[PDB]
Amino acid sequence: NQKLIANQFNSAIGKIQDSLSSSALGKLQDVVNQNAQALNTLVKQLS
Amino acid sequence: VCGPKKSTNLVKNKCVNFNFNGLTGTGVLTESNKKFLPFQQFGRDIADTT
């Protein structure tokens, strides 16, 4: 079934791009948002 | 009613102590591209620093 298996793999890889061009990286965006919020609170405590 | 208030002349592009009308600080003065409204005196940023 080699040709069928290669075709299924190629279309499954092609759907990852179309899912990512729409997000799904929330676990990496949370870390950035938390560190920026903590530095902003530290700086606003000087007033 | 009070006395007069003296003024020196401003120097750009080097580290000074400044005093603009009761707002003191220390830093480097440089010409800007910001445009205020004609009643505003100074600007701040997100963290409320001048």
User: What is the spatial distance between Cα B19 and Cα B13, in angstroms, rounded to a whole number?
Assistant: 16
Query: What 8-state DSSP symbol labels residue B9?
Result: -
Q: Which residues of B touch A43 (CB under 8 A)?
A: 47, 49
C-alpha span between B40 and A46 (Å, rounded): 23
Structure-determination technique: cryo-EM
Strand partners, B19: B24
Rounded alpha-carbon distances, angstroms, from residue B46 to A13, B11, B30, B43: 43, 27, 21, 10
Which residues in A lie closer than 8 A to residue B47 (C-beta atoms)? 40, 43-44
The alpha carbon of residue A43 is apart from the nearest alpha carbon of chain B, in Å, by 6
Place of tokens 């069928």: A4
Across the interface, do B48 and A40 touch by the CB < 8 Å criterion? Answer: no
Q: CB A24: neighbour CB atoms within 10 A?
A: 9
Tokens of B30: 């440089």
